[PDB]
């Protein structure tokens, strides 16, 4: 009974901090680099390969500088981690599109500043 429509989440997502697809891609590729140097190592699971390919293909941001800049930008606004991560990973192109994608977003913040934040996300992409 936990979803974005209600935002009534467990004590665990209350404690943990969410990550974006580009950060997860960076972390997984770093892990892959460390694993490859390892010798006589139970190789990485095929599931990890599939997840890595998925994360790399849909990575909206390409460098750690861009990721840090986006993180600071979104950290400035008063946004919960779940909405922040969902907007950053999907990256809606229009304010109406984001309103439709995340119902929780509508009715919370004004749309002129949402258009501004969305355009900032677009400009962050490279």
């Amino acid at each position: 009974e936990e979803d974005a429509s209600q935002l009534i989440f467990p004590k665990e997502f209350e404690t943990a901090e969410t990550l974006l697809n580009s950060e997860v891609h960076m972390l997984l590729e770093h892990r892959k680099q460390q694993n490859e140097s390892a010798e006589d190592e139970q190789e990485l699971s095929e599931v990890f390969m599939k997840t890595l390919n998925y994360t790399a293909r849909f990575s909206r941001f390409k460098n750690r500088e861009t990721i840090a800049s986006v993180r600071s930008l979104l950290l400035q606004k008063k946004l919960h981690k779940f909405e922040l991560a969902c907007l950053a990973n999907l990256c809606p192109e229009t304010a109406e599109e984001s309103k439709a994608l995340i119902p929780s977003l509508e009715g919370r913040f004004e749309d002129e500043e949402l258009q501004q934040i969305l355009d900032d996300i677009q400009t962050k992409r490279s």
Binding site: E36, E43, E93, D119, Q122, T123, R125
Partner: protein, 922 residues
Amino acid sequence: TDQDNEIRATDLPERFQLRSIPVKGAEDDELEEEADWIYRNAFATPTISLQESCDYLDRRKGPSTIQKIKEALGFMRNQHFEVPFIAFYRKEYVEPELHINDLWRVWQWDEKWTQLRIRKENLTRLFEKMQAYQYEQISADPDKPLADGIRALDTTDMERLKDVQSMDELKDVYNHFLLYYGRDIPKMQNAAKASRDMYTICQSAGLDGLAKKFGLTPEQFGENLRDSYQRHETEQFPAEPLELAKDYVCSQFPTPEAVLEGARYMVALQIAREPLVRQVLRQTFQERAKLNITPTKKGRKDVDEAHYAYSFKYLKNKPVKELRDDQFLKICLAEDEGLLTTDISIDLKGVEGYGNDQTYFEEIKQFYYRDEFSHQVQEWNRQRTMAIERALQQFLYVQMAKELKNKLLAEAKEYVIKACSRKLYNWLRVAPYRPDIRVLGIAFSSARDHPVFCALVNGEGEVTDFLRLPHFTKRRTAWREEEREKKAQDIETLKKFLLNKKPHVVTVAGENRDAQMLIEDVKRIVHELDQGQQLSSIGVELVDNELAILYMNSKKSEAEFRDYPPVLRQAVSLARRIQDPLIEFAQVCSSDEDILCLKFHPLQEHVVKEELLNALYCEFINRVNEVGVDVNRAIAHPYSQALIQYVCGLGPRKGTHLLKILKQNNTRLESRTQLVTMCHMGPKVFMNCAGFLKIDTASLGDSTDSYIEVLDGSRVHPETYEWARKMAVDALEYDNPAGALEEILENPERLKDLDLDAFAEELERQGYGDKHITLYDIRAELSCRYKDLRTAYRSPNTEEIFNMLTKETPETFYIGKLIICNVTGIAHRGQAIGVKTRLDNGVTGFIPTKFLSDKVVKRPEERVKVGMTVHCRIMKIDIEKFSADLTCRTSDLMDRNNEWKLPKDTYYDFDAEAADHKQEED
């Protein structure tokens, strides 16, 4: 289900109805377009990779085949004639360019044309709807010029869609259409209904207007690429790229460099999506593409000499044209397992300094360049250079390389399917055994304790008696006395059985090398009977038991012979197979995909199952129709009923229904006419299958009060019965129709006196077309009714016997291969010559004393013992004696000089291989 009832009633070939895309009539114009399209894409289009012609019926084609293809299309599309009917009764229209197998290719490619035609129709509607909706804005305000973001969907785009000849070109048109009009279609849908990514960012920001100032349109640049020169001169603009960039600067693109960066993407993407650019590059990749392979960490240790990817472990600058047969499939399979990584590129890798090493990007850089030294031109030239650089590497190189790999992979899979078809055709082409019939099939198991079961089948393949020999596998020369006594008793038991039953031929399963020992025992027993002339000579044959094994496993054998053990059941199949391989193969291979259980090709499992299955069943249809099917024999012998489904124009459903009516009426198929009067067969279905169904008129006898047509037991189609009667009348030089036909069959020698050349004109004069081929076929049938065209049975040769018993092939058993053998003794001639070994496949190996070790060997006794396992390398192979010379020297195993290892690829990257293991040592 009700679908089967509809198919049973419909007067169309069952396979035609079962086709995914329903067969529809084709107009003359459509036939002409389809015939040319089929010929270009199916017979006149060489494969990129090296593929040898699989055609085996012939005992390439020019434009003349287009007319033949059109004739074949008309017979199928309009007249609903199946491929077997056309190849057997419409030869004059399709031959000699088109054969039965080629007609299948046309039939297969006929389906491809229809789907491509349908897609073009759908895209045409979409283009028209966009063309109309876009015009709505112009209609309201014609004065206002179209915005730079609103391209004109002119007839050039529409005609380009009409000129599409392939799916790949269709996608280019569709992708090009979406790039410019993809955004507005959802608005188009609402307007039509009511009336009844990174690209879009640059459009909203207005960078599209800037994108038009770079010098050329995507279509213009594509023309330059096509002609390989500056067909269109780039238009220069006064202001520098940065000066125009600041004009488009906004919140989305603050810096001028970002403005140019965003604009540059539009040019690169637009160039990539241009179908003309895509078409030109698509041709370029097919001409200069090269394959590079580098093993992964996993493959660096997994790909040893015995691995199937050893030959292409390292590849450097190997043109795709060099790939042959299923070489690419193995490369893809190795990649699928993570053993290596592939790369398709049009530029040489690590070949710096080679003459004319400029990459494809450099060659076309001058096709979008302005030759001026002005500073502004250089900036614009620099801006132009990066856009194409992005266009090639980011989009065109990636898409085209992927497209080529799919094209290359499909060709490799097609070869594998072609190989599978060849194997099945050879098995089905073997004619029934003809003694120089009653068959005694003998089968045995690899285990020593297992007995030997002999199954006797009469002429119709019905089991009449069987023999069990508990100790037939034992050697009559065994030193132990009881074994000889046990072996001796079984010999006489078979001797008495042979004397009474008098089988015409004895077939022994080629389970293993022990089959040879059984052959000698059976032959010796027959020799004793023939020595005293108490019994005629009985043929002894060795038959592969792969099909027999499948029947032993198949649950169908259980129903037929519940009490017969598996070894005895396979004995029946071996005896049945020699009697008629086609019947056995069809009966053994049921609708449960049991055919795939047979080993056609090593990589037959890596190809499309539906494509492989369709090709295999085509061989059955071709062979079954050629041989013919006897309905009366099937009714009396249910096991032979599996041939009716393969009959032309019947299929599994109608074929099963045909037996049901005949068995329901408790009558026989006395004449072909009964298929319509009694079985209620449609005229179209009758046309396809009437000539391929045989009735044994002589077997009917006087019990059949109704009229019996002698021609019903011949390939002559009912439509040409009057022609056959006329031919018989002319042969005897009469001056009745039922008398000459009967007499000529008894003495057909008078047929040669006929002048069939003259008879052709008379038919042509009265409007029957060219029938010279048909007339010759009619004359041949009169000489011999339903003469078997299958290849005469012959005993397996030495090469086949070695493969049959050892289950080994040259690819898997070759000189220099590393094998494992067990020592069984020391070869003597005190004095010794080497060590004798036995392989797991039954081959007896021999290790000479000199090859027994790197250093000199004094006595072989201490080096190896009986039962010891020694790793050895094959030096020579003696298939005739199932012997092979072996060496176990440590230096030989190491093979530092690579003398024993299999040949590597011509473009093998030895430099990469040397470096890889060199870094490993460090």
